Design a protein around this motif. Structure first.
Motif, short mmCIF file in Angstrom:
data_model
loop_
_atom_site.label_atom_id
_atom_site.label_comp_id
_atom_site.label_asym_id
_atom_site.label_seq_id
_atom_site.Cartn_x
_atom_site.Cartn_y
_atom_site.Cartn_z
N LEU A 1 0.98 -1.14 -0.25
CA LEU A 1 -0.01 0.46 -0.15
C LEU A 1 0.66 1.43 0.00
N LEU A 2 2.24 1.33 0.37
CA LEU A 2 2.77 2.30 0.51
C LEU A 2 3.58 2.13 -0.64
N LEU A 3 3.59 1.34 -1.48
CA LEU A 3 4.19 1.33 -2.34
C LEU A 3 3.82 1.46 -3.65
N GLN A 4 2.34 1.80 -3.65
CA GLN A 4 0.86 2.37 -4.09
C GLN A 4 1.30 3.85 -4.22
N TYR A 5 0.93 4.37 -2.29
CA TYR A 5 1.19 6.05 -2.40
C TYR A 5 2.25 6.25 -3.31
N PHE A 6 3.42 5.65 -2.95
CA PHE A 6 4.75 6.19 -3.70
C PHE A 6 4.72 5.87 -4.80
N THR A 7 4.24 5.18 -6.01
CA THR A 7 4.41 5.59 -7.56
C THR A 7 2.66 6.37 -6.90
N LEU A 8 2.34 6.90 -6.84
CA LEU A 8 0.67 7.89 -7.62
C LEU A 8 1.93 8.83 -8.95
N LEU A 9 0.62 9.47 -9.46
CA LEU A 9 1.32 10.99 -9.96
C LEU A 9 0.68 12.60 -8.79
N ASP A 10 1.17 13.42 -9.53
CA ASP A 10 1.27 15.00 -8.39
C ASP A 10 0.44 15.59 -8.75
N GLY A 11 -0.58 16.19 -7.76
CA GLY A 11 -1.48 17.06 -7.46
C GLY A 11 -0.32 17.85 -6.50
N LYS A 12 -1.73 18.34 -5.59
CA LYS A 12 -1.23 18.55 -3.57
C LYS A 12 -1.51 17.07 -2.40
N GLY A 13 -2.97 16.89 -3.10
CA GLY A 13 -3.28 15.78 -1.96
C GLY A 13 -2.06 14.30 -2.26
N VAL A 14 -2.04 14.21 -3.66
CA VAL A 14 -1.43 12.89 -3.54
C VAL A 14 0.11 13.31 -3.52
N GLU A 15 0.58 14.45 -4.28
CA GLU A 15 1.90 14.69 -3.35
C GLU A 15 2.29 14.11 -1.87
N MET A 16 0.97 14.96 -1.07
CA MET A 16 1.26 14.68 0.92
C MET A 16 0.97 13.00 1.03
N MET A 17 0.32 12.72 0.59
CA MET A 17 0.62 11.70 0.69
C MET A 17 1.82 10.00 0.40
N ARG A 18 2.09 10.86 -0.82
CA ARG A 18 3.07 10.33 -1.05
C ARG A 18 4.71 10.60 -0.52
N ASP A 19 4.21 12.27 -0.31
CA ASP A 19 5.67 12.30 0.70
C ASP A 19 5.63 11.14 2.30
N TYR A 20 3.73 11.57 2.64
CA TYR A 20 4.17 10.44 3.53
C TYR A 20 4.40 9.28 3.48
N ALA A 21 4.04 8.30 2.07
CA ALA A 21 4.00 6.90 2.05
C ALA A 21 6.29 7.14 2.00
N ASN A 22 6.91 7.91 1.52
CA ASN A 22 8.01 8.08 1.24
C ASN A 22 9.20 7.52 2.45
N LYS A 23 8.26 8.87 3.12
CA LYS A 23 8.77 8.93 5.10
C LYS A 23 8.60 7.62 5.85
N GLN A 24 7.74 6.98 5.30
CA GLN A 24 7.32 5.51 6.25
C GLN A 24 8.41 4.82 6.01
N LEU A 25 8.09 4.56 4.16
CA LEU A 25 9.00 3.60 4.36
C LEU A 25 10.73 3.87 4.47
N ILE A 26 11.10 5.16 4.16
CA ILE A 26 12.61 4.68 4.78
C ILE A 26 12.44 4.81 6.33
N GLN A 27 12.03 5.24 7.34
CA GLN A 27 11.83 5.32 8.37
C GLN A 27 11.51 3.89 8.39
N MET A 28 10.94 2.89 8.31
CA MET A 28 10.69 1.55 8.54
C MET A 28 12.38 0.46 8.16
N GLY A 29 12.73 1.83 7.34
CA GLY A 29 13.89 0.62 6.50
C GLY A 29 13.72 -0.28 5.16
#
Lengths: 45, 541, 54, 107
Positions: free
Chosen positions: B513-541
């Motif tokens: 699910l976080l990967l799907q958020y990572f591979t999304l397009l960019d507006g503003k809301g999907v931008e926020m979700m993708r930033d959150y997903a990438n942060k969570q993935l990096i944090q989880m390692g």
């Protein structure tokens, strides 16, 4: 009448001479406007 | 000895071999596209009623829509033992230059002709694009071919559906005068000498101006051994490069750059030559083109050989008899309705002499009167009134209309569904992938991925021209068939959604699910979700 | 169209007259020739004859 | 009917006609562009002639006309016939608009 269409072959011809004789095919446009003749030189003496 | 004579003799051999199939395919195209009364051709007739009450166009439309709802495209997969991402670069290149409208249009045209006549085709060409190039200032695009049955004359000695074993192919182009002028400008031909070739079209419809200028392009593949030079890459390892590909441009530049010649070998490969020819001369002789395969891809319907003679067919061929019979019967009945006397009484003139205004059809009288007496015969003879019989459609006409319609209904059932036709399209797509891979390896700058990053190693000649370098170890991925995707991000999204559709709600479900958020397009809301997903993935390692 | 002046035009209406002209075609203009199968090994004269005909 | 009148009087008894071309002279010709038309048709392939002939179209250059290129073969004598036909007719639909110019018409 009863009839079967198996052929009864009667001729078995063989072609050694025209198999051995070489076949020559010169260019068609050249023969057409040269009247179907072509000249070859002869070994020089 | 004459190159023209050889090319001709081959073309006439193939054109005579493919006569009956081409005639039937062209008749199928005419039947299913223009008209079902193939009468204009040659019949000495008059002007009667001829209507087309179609019953086959709905079936053709249903089949084409069904096959359009399921797009199919190449899918490059790494071979066994190769790097797991060996095909990503090739797949990205292929999507980049096949996402255009021209490729989709070519595929759709080929599919429609495959459904209707039995054979379609398309072409893969290359060009120099300077604004958006795929690689090396070049782009590989796909072009359509209309009426492939008469316009693509394949080798007669080919027994494969995709014609991978064909050794030559002649493609015929008919164009108007301005079309010819632009063709000559494009190919550096003499526009004054108007070319002429074997006309592929028949004047079967009252068209005014069909076409007058024809030319052909003869592709031929030659499989021969050519010199292969082995070098030593200044980075690591030994690369291989064909002698002809760097014969003069960089042959002395590799040594200066740091490549030392280790060995020279002979390797067998295929080369493709194109000849632009007319009926009386050759204008371009043996121009090298990219790749090892002929760039024409055919698509077939039901394909086979009867007796060393090719037969291919779509869906329209057998419905022709029933459709023509049904059209004829309906026209006969329409004539019956139109030209037939109506039901009226039979009268003697003396039976209604003087009362003729009562019978004209008005409604001013309460009854009809008839004369009873004759001065010479005493009385008019009495006989029951007779009326002209009402028109009736004959039992034969009714029976045969129903029977012909039922016959077309029973025979116009492709398969049960278009599984076999989609499988033939998949075969054609695999051929397209093979050809495209060969052309890419010939002209594009394919990098090599090291596990120590992609290494783009090239050199330039003294004429400021870039000469690509591809090692011989190029066929690291094979060709398959998958869904049609416009880009690699779309492909990745599809893969992640498919994996999510089978993973249960564990921790991998969160990961996907976080990967799907990572591979999304960019507006503003999907931008926020993708930033959150990438942060969570990096944090989880 | 004609014209008439005045307020009262009883029984002075007029009908519509549209004349017409006829067009027709003449006998075809032709080129016509015959050749044997041994004369078509060149085809240059054939093509030149076609273009000259046009 | 009088709306279509184009001459002041009519032809009345012994009126002399005058011939206006009294010497030979190459003509200059003027017209309004819609006065001359060319009614053309491709010959149908179902014609009585062009019977056993394979017919295609044939674009006559320059002018906007299309004729028929028909071809037939013979097997007894290994021969063939080509026939290029063109079917058209030039029609003057406004002769009052067409004109002619005759210089040097000295009687």
């Amino acid at each position: 009448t009863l009839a079967v269409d198996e052929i009864i072959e009667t001729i078995s011809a063989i072609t050694p001479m025209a198999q051995k004789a070489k076949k020559y095919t010169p260019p068609a446009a050249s023969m057409q406007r040269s009247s179907n003749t072509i000249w070859m030189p002869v070994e020089q003496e | 000895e004459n190159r023209l004579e050889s090319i001709l003799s081959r073309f006439d051999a193939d054109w005579t071999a493919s006569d009956e199939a081409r005639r039937e395919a062209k008749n199928d195209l005419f039947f299913s596209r223009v008209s079902q009364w193939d009468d204009w051709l040659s019949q000495y007739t008059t002007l009667q009623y001829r209507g087309q009450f179609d019953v086959v166009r709905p079936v053709v439309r249903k089949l084409v829509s069904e096959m359009r709802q399921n797009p199919i495209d190449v899918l490059y997969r790494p071979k066994d033992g190769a790097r797991p991402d060996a095909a990503d670069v090739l797949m990205g290149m292929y999507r980049t230059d096949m996402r255009h409208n021209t490729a989709k249009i070519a595929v759709n045209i080929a599919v429609r002709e495959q459904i209707e006549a039995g054979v379609g085709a398309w072409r893969l060409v290359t060009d120099y694009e300077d604004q958006s190039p795929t690689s090396n200032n070049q782009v590989i695009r796909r072009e359509p071919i209309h009426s492939a049955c008469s316009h693509v004359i394949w080798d007669s000695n080919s027994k494969l559906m995709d014609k991978s074993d064909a050794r030559h192919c002649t493609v015929i182009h008919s164009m108007s005068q301005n079309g010819w002028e632009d063709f000559a400008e494009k190919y550096d031909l003499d526009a004054d000498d108007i070319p002429s070739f074997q006309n592929p079209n028949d004047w079967v419809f009252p068209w005014l101006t069909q076409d007058t200028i024809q030319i052909a392009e003869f592709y031929e593949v030659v499989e021969k051994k050519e010199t292969a030079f082995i070098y030593q890459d200044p980075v690591t390892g030994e690369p291989v490069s064909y002698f002809k590909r760097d014969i003069k441009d960089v042959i002395d530049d590799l040594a200066d750059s740091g490549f030392i010649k280790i060995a020279e070998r002979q390797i067998k490969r295929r080369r493709v030559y194109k000849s632009i020819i007319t009926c009386t001369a050759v204008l371009k002789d043996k121009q090298l083109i990219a790749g090892e395969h002929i760039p024409i891809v055919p698509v077939f319907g039901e394909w086979g050989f009867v007796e060393d003679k090719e037969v291919y067919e779509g869906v329209v061929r057998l419905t022709k008899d029933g459709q023509r019979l049904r059209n004829m019967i309906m026209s006969f009945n329409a004539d019956i309705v139109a030209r037939t006397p109506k039901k009226k009484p039979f009268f003697w003139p003396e039976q209604i002499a003087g009362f003729e205004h009562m019978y004209d059809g008005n409604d001013d009288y309460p009854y009809y009167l008839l004369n009873r007496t004759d001065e010479n015969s005493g009385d008019l003879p009495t006989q029951p009134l007779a009326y002209y019989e009402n028109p009736e459609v004959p039992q034969a006409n009714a029976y045969m209309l129903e029977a012909a319609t039922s016959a077309v209904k029973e025979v116009a059932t492709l398969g049960v569904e278009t599984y076999v036709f989609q499988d033939n399209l998949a075969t054609a797509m695999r051929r397209d992938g093979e050809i495209y891979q060969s052309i890419v390896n010939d002209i594009y700058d394919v990098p090599r991925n090291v596990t120590i990053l992609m290494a783009e190693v090239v050199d330039l000649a003294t004429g400021e021209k870039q000469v690509l370098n591809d090692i011989r170890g190029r066929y690291e991925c094979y060709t398959d068939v998958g869904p049609s995707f416009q880009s690699m991000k779309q492909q990745n999204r599809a893969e992640i959604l498919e994996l999510l559709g089978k993973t249960p709600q564990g921790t991998p479900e969160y990961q996907l699910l976080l990967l799907q958020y990572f591979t999304l397009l960019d507006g503003k809301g999907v931008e926020m979700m993708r930033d959150y997903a990438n942060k969570q993935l990096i944090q989880m390692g | 169209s004609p014209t008439q002046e005045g307020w009262d035009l009883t029984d002075k209406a007029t009908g519509l007259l549209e004349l017409n002209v006829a067009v027709n075609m003449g006998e075809p203009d032709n080129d016509f020739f015959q050749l044997r199968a041994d004369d078509l090994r060149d085809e240059t004269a054939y093509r030149r004859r076609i273009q000259s005909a046009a | 009917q009088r709306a279509y009148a184009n001459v002041n009087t009519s032809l009345a008894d012994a009126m002399a006609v005058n011939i206006l071309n009294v010497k030979d002279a190459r003509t200059n010709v003027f017209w309004a562009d819609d006065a001359i038309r060319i009614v053309s048709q491709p010959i149908p392939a179902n014609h009585e002639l062009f019977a056993g002939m394979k017919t295609t179209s044939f674009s006559i250059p320059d002018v906007g006309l299309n004729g028929i290129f028909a071809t037939q073969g013979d097997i007894s004598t290994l021969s063939g016939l080509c026939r290029i036909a063109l079917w058209y007719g030039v029609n003057a639909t406004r002769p009052e608009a067409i004109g002619v110019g005759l210089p040097g018409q000295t009687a």
